[PDB]
């Protein structure tokens, strides 16, 4: 009787959920220790770091255990309820918007702090910066209220009455769904993508023409060598952002762009396995934003093993 149950076998399922659980534990412990560390002068970048860390901690701890509890093992008869599903996708879309806007404004603060630094001394202040943190949180909530305006419950049994056939799906029509998730992918992926990539290439270009041309001794090429390690910590953040938040948004828009005429059974199976892959990559990003901020800089490595042990 339970139709619309996909036959996903248990070996790949337990491999994916083991990847998920390892990702979750290392990501929540990393975001916990970096949030407590930044909770432990021009300190206008620590707020962006802590805000992105809190956004990653929030998306992990709110989506991921509920995600394994009612998305990979327990299929279409769910157990979280109407307010549960609507608030769950509200928090998911809000955390995605918050992580995207955190990448935007962190890259903007870096660009003002290097390529126009006197305008950062004039413009950027700790008070304003806290105002911008509250502003991007309120922008995430205001852009996630259409996720409250688009979600719902829908029975898709043989007569639409069975309590083992109701799913929690976008209940709006295909066109308005297209529009909301297309502006979702457009803003919350592409404008972060071009903004973070353009400003990080300009910052890396300014650093490379500051250490190569040098307008003096480079200091036996030691501090500028770790400045090229800073080029690595720039480029690694931007490539991690694009390579993690690209396929999730491609999967959202391939859910929008197909209207059952291009779906087959194998493409249904491939869509569900690709959904496990893209949410694996989202939890990858949620784990390796604090891991990228921790491991590649040895001072963070020492102080966080001092926090751990």
């Amino acid at each position: 009787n339970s139709d619309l149950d996909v036959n996903t076998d248990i070996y790949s399922k337990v491999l994916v959920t083991a990847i998920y659980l390892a990702l979750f534990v290392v990501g929540t412990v990393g975001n916990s220790v970096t949030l407590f560390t930044l909770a432990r002068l021009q300190s206008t970048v620590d707020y962006y770091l802590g805000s992105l860390a809190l956004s990653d901690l929030l998306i992990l701890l709110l989506a991921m255990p509920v995600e394994l509890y009612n998305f990979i093992w327990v299929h279409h008869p769910w157990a979280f309820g109407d307010a549960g599903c609507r608030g769950y996708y509200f928090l998911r879309d809000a955390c995605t918007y918050a992580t995207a806007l955190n990448v935007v404004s962190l890259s903007v603060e870096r660009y003002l702090a290097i390529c126009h630094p006197f305008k950062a001394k004039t413009l950027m202040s700790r008070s304003r910066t806290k105002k911008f943190i509250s502003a991007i949180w309120l922008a995430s909530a205001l852009l996630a209220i259409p996720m409250l305006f688009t979600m719902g419950l829908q029975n898709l049994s043989g007569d639409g009455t069975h309590p083992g056939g109701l799913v929690c799906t976008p209940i709006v029509d295909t066109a308005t769904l297209k529009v909301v998730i297309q502006v979702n992918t457009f803003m919350s992926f592409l404008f972060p993508m071009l903004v973070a990539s353009i400003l990080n290439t300009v910052i890396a270009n300014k650093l490379t023409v500051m250490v190569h041309q040098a307008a003096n001794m480079t200091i036996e090429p030691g501090r500028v060598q770790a400045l090229r390690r800073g080029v690595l910590v720039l480029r690694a953040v931007v490539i991690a952002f694009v390579v993690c938040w690209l396929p999730y948004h491609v999967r959202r828009l391939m859910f929008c762009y197909i209207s059952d005429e291009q779906w087959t059974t194998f493409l249904f199976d491939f869509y569900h396995y690709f959904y496990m892959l893209t949410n694996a990559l989202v939890y990858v990003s949620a784990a390796i934003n604090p891991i990228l901020y921790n491991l590649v800089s040895a001072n963070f490595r020492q102080v966080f093993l001092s926090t751990l042990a």
Binding site: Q154, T169, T264, F268, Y275
Partner: peptide
């Protein structure tokens, strides 16, 4: 046969 999970 359209997927429902987003």
């Amino acid at each position: 046969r359209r997927p429902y999970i987003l």
